[PDB]
């Protein structure tokens, strides 16, 4: 690509969600979602291979139908009330159709079958964007209408996302799919609590971003896309094992790391409203979500694997890849539990 094209496309990606936030009109929110859709595709398809073409096609076709369903909901609301804002006393069918379309946009189960494929079929960057910057505005729509939502199917979609993300990421050798299933489970955790104190949704979102972005950078630093490729890290970049370990053990919520904070306070604010046993199920399947992280950091850190003879050139040569924000994002994660009242 050329600089003017990159400026245009990245500015459009920045303005998609930024339009979706600073917009009372739901039509302009839809416009922002379409901006994100339209501008992400040139970078999913920048390498021009069959995997990239398939990923971009699946993304486009899955997101356009959800956009059209959200537009159906908006048009029905305008017909009902003569207003471009979801008031109260709308129709539950409208609100549920909106919620299902947004679930298809995010990747929540049972609308999840497209995210691992697409994340596999693209570079390490544009998986980061796809999993972090594209989850925000769809979440903004829900955040703005959290009292209107059905507490039933919001939780069914959550629970299904947790179960399917854990059971998907359990058996994936490819890391681009493990991060996608992690995204699915974390979005389940968010959307479970979204009708209850929606600030915790944004908390879990920021935690998830601050974990995943360093992880995708770690995979970038040697173009790692497989367990057997991240296992050859004690020979190439052996100073990253510590942070990778602590961040994976944060993603799988464990106490002293800040990745247990979202699950903990989410279970708290659910137990305040008698969502006891659903919270128990989610907390218990988060362990199955943690199992493959444990296996992963075994494979790379604790039982260092066989290496190759050609990996010694890598030892001779030098690197410049860590961007000075890897350390910051990995250290604000894994170490910011005592600041939890300053987070909530």
């Amino acid at each position: 690509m050329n600089p003017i094209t990159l400026a245009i496309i990245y500015f459009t990606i920045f303005l998609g969600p930024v339009i979706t936030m600073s917009s009372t009109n739901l039509m302009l929110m839809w416009v922002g979602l379409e901006f994100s859709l339209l501008a992400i595709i040139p970078m999913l398809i920048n390498k021009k291979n069959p995997r990239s073409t398939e990923a971009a096609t699946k993304y486009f076709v899955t997101q356009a139908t959800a956009s059209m369903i959200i537009l159906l909901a908006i048009v029905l609301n305008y017909k009902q009330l003569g207003t471009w804002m979801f008031q109260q006393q709308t129709n539950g069918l409208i609100l549920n159709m909106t919620l299902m379309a947004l679930s298809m946009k995010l990747g929540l189960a049972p609308f999840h079958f497209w995210l691992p494929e697409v994340t596999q079929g693209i570079p390490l960057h544009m998986g980061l964007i796809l999993l972090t910057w594209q989850k925000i505005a769809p979440l903004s729509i829900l955040i703005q209408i959290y009292p209107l939502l059905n507490s039933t199917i919001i939780l069914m979609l959550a629970i299904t996302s947790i179960f399917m993300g854990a059971w998907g990421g359990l058996n994936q050798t490819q890391m681009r799919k493990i991060m996608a299933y992690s995204s699915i489970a974390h979005m389940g955790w968010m959307l479970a609590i979204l009708p209850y104190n929606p600030s915790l949704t944004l908390l879990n979102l920021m935690i998830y971003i601050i974990l995943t972005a360093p992880m995708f950078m770690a995979l970038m630093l040697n173009n790692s896309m497989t367990i057997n490729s991240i296992s050859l890290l004690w020979n190439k970049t052996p100073a990253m094992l510590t942070m990778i370990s602590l961040m994976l053990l944060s993603l799988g919520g464990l106490p002293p790391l800040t990745g247990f904070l979202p699950k903990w306070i989410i279970i708290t604010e659910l137990m305040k409203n008698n969502c006891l046993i659903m919270a128990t199920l989610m907390a218990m399947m988060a362990l199955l979500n943690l199992f493959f992280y444990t296996r992963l950091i075994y494979s790379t850190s604790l039982t260092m694997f066989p290496t190759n003879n050609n990996s010694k050139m890598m030892t001779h040569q030098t690197k410049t890849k860590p961007n000075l924000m890897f350390s910051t994002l990995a250290i604000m994660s894994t170490m910011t539990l005592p600041l939890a009242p300053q987070l909530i």
Binding site: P338, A340, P341, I344
Partner: protein
């Protein structure tokens, strides 16, 4: 639940004009100068009060003033006026530029007799400050008494009592 109060038929019976639109447009500019106080009082009734049922006599006065207008036209300047609107009706949009030699005749007749001067280009298109013995309408829209808003918490705030009551953080 409540019923609509509608007038009766004889409360709507008027000496009406029974006159066409070309002949009406041909005299519009003088019907805006003469017969203006009644028209504008009717407009203020119809717009200040959003009920047609409360401006009926004003409409009848509009009709009567128009009748007197056309009768004063029928006493003097009937045939030039007939010529004017008869040429004017031939058009499809009822435009004035095609009938401009008859305007002069009609205006000269009605300026000699009855002393009516024609308004200029933009005189009929400005607010015109009518008075009336009526009272203002108290609460148009029949707005119900609004509910009182939720009260404001008065006070200059202080530290949180024992800091953050989170789980076990002291400060």
């Amino acid at each position: 639940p409540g019923i609509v109060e509608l007038p009766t038929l004889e409360e709507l019976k008027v000496e009406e004009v029974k006159v066409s639109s070309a002949v009406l447009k041909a005299a519009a500019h003088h019907y805006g100068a003469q017969c203006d106080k009644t028209n504008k009082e009717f407009m203020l009734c119809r717009w200040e009060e959003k009920d047609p049922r409360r401006c009926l006599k004003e409409g009848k006065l509009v009709n009567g003033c128009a009748l007197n207008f056309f009768r004063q036209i029928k006493s003097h300047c009937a045939e030039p006026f007939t010529e004017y609107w008869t040429c004017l009706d031939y058009s499809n949009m009822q435009l004035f530029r095609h009938c401009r030699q008859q305007q002069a005749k009609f205006d000269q007749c009605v300026l000699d007799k009855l002393g009516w001067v024609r308004p200029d280009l933009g005189q009929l298109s400005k607010v015109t400050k009518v008075k009336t013995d009526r009272p203002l309408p108290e609460n148009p829209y029949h707005s119900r008494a609004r509910p009182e808003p939720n009260p404001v918490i008065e006070g200059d705030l202080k530290p949180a009592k024992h800091g953050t009551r989170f789980f076990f953080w002291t400060v």
